[PDB]
Structure 1
Amino acid sequence: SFIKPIYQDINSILIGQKVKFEKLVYKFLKENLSDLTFKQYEYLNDLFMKNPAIIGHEARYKLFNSPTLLFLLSRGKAATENWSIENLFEEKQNDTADILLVKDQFYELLDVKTRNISKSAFAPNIISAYKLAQTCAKMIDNKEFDLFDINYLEVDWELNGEDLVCVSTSFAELFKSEPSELYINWAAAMQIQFHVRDLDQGFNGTREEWAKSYLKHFVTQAEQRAISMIDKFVKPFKKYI
């Protein structure tokens, strides 16, 4: 992680800060690691602007130089072909990542999770367990085991008067967690869910092993969900029909 080494710095600047979008972690990152930091759409704009000679989606999709990163970051074919310096990508809540840090052809996908710590703790959607499954599949098929990390920054806040105030933060790395410990909440858009501060970081094996261990986990949890569907959505309603 490019962020981990300066976590103490970030934590100190965020705590006590106030919003009247605490995802102004971007501001700090952009101002301290200006060459590395992009919002996802910015990175895509940047990428395409720097290759004016490349037109149409097929060619622009080659710019990624990576099937896995293509899958994680790129917009759709029509959006890509229609892109121009006069028609730039804008932010979208559907984008995989909030912030991208990129250096030496290595990518850190950062996802900020904001959290009102005044309320009963509710583990947020982290990422589609299905998207992550495809990601691991693609990592394996293309042997891309040293290309990117997916990391999370929890920003805790509470209402104090007229404004929300940050009171703490946490940071963790998806690929340092034990895959079998990942909670997959099928109803909630098949999303993995955890609080960043609770994420175990004790995985010892390789990235490839992580990917293989995750796929086994995912496949296993899918089977369990299908079974659970009978018990929760079928059996209790049989009697009315």
Structure 2
Amino acid sequence: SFIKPIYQDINSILIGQKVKRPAAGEPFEKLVYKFLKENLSDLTFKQYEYLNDLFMKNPAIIGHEARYKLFNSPTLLFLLSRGKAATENWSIENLFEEKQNDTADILLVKDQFYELLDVKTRNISKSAFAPNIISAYKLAQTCAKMIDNKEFDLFDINYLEVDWELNGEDLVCVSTSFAELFKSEPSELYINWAAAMQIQFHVRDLDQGFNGTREEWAKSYLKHFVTQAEQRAISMIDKFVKPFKKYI
């Protein structure tokens, strides 16, 4: 993680910091971005801003196929790149904006290594509700592609969690948390199928005691994923079928 060495720096900056009251705390992410662009400026990219960048760097490379070759990475191409029609229709006069379904919130790159940082926010006033982290399915392909292409030391997926509460007309940061996905026990990940199949947890609750290699983590997760999938399917007959079979 490029952000860890100065996490403490951030915690101090964000704790206390306030924002406008109209996710709910989307402002806080901006602050986090703003901050990063000030201390790790030559590393910081909103996801789309990296695509725009890479395509300006080679204007004689047009069409999707050619543009896709510019990633040097099947895994990354899969996590970061936009559609084939979207990549086709890219131009200086037609840059990428934000995309709702996009993988990361913020991207930290340095010497071909990539940290993909999601910035999650939380209303601590209300009852804890573990948010969607990432698609269990998307993560699955990610792991598969990692294995197939030998890409084991190219990129990390990390999260920052900004805790806030309602205080008058503005909203304030009470605390934060930081964790790294590939440093958690894969088989302890909670997959909520019904919830668009998303792994779920609060960052402060994520464990960081994985011991093996990156490649072990992927196999281990794929193992857990496949296993949760086998079990989810049977559990479906009982929840959504059985209880209703009488009425028909």
Distance in 1 (alpha carbons) for counterparts of 2:133 and 2:2: 20
1:224 aligns with 2:234: no
Residues 129 and 190 of structure 1 are in contact (CA less than 8 Å); yes or no, is this contact kept in structure 2?
A: yes
Deviation of 1:93 after TM superposition, in Å, equals 1.7
Instruction: Give the secondary-structure state (helix, strand or coil) at the position aligned to 1:95.
Output: coil
The Cα of 1:53 is off from its aligned counterpart by 1.2
**Is the 1:113–1:155 contact (alpha carbons within 8 Å) kept by the matching residues of 2?**
yes
Please name the residue that 1:126 is paired with: 133
With normalisation by structure 1, the TM-score equals 0.99
How far, CA to CA, are the matches of 1:216 and 1:3 in structure 2?
30
Quick one: distance in 1 between partners of 2:189 and 2:51? 30
Aligned length: 241
- Per the TM alignment, residue 150 of structure 1 is displaced from its structure 2 partner at its CA by 0.3
Unaligned runs of 5+ in 2: 21-27
Runs of 4+ in 1 over 3 A off after TM superposition: none
Q: How far off its partner does 1:22 sit?
A: 3.9
**1:51-91 Cα distance to aligned partner (Å, 9 max, x none):** 11111110110110000000000000010011001100001
3-state SS of the aligned residue for 2:117?
strand
Identical-pair percentage:
100
Q: What is the root-mean-square deviation of aligned Cα atoms in Å?
A: 0.7
Task: Quote the offset at 1:144 in angstroms.
Answer: 0.2
Deviation at 1:92, TM superposition (A): 1.4
Alignment partners' CA distance in 2, 1:133 and 1:64: 20
- 1:210 is paired with a residue whose SS is helix
Q: Tell me, in whole angstroms, the C-alpha distance in 1 between the residues paired with 2:102 and 2:38.
A: 23
Instruction: Name the CA distance, whole Å, in 2 between partners of 1:22 and 1:213.
Output: 32
Aligned to 2:244: 237
- Aligned equivalent of 1:100, options 97, 104, 107: 107
Tell me how far apart the structure 2 counterparts of residues 112 and 152 of structure 1 sit (CA, whole Å): 6
Q: Tell me if the contact between 1:23 and 1:112 (Cα under 8 Å) persists in the aligned partners.
A: no
How far apart are 1:24 and its partner, in Å? 2.1
Which sections of structure 1, spanning at least 5 residues, go unmatched? none
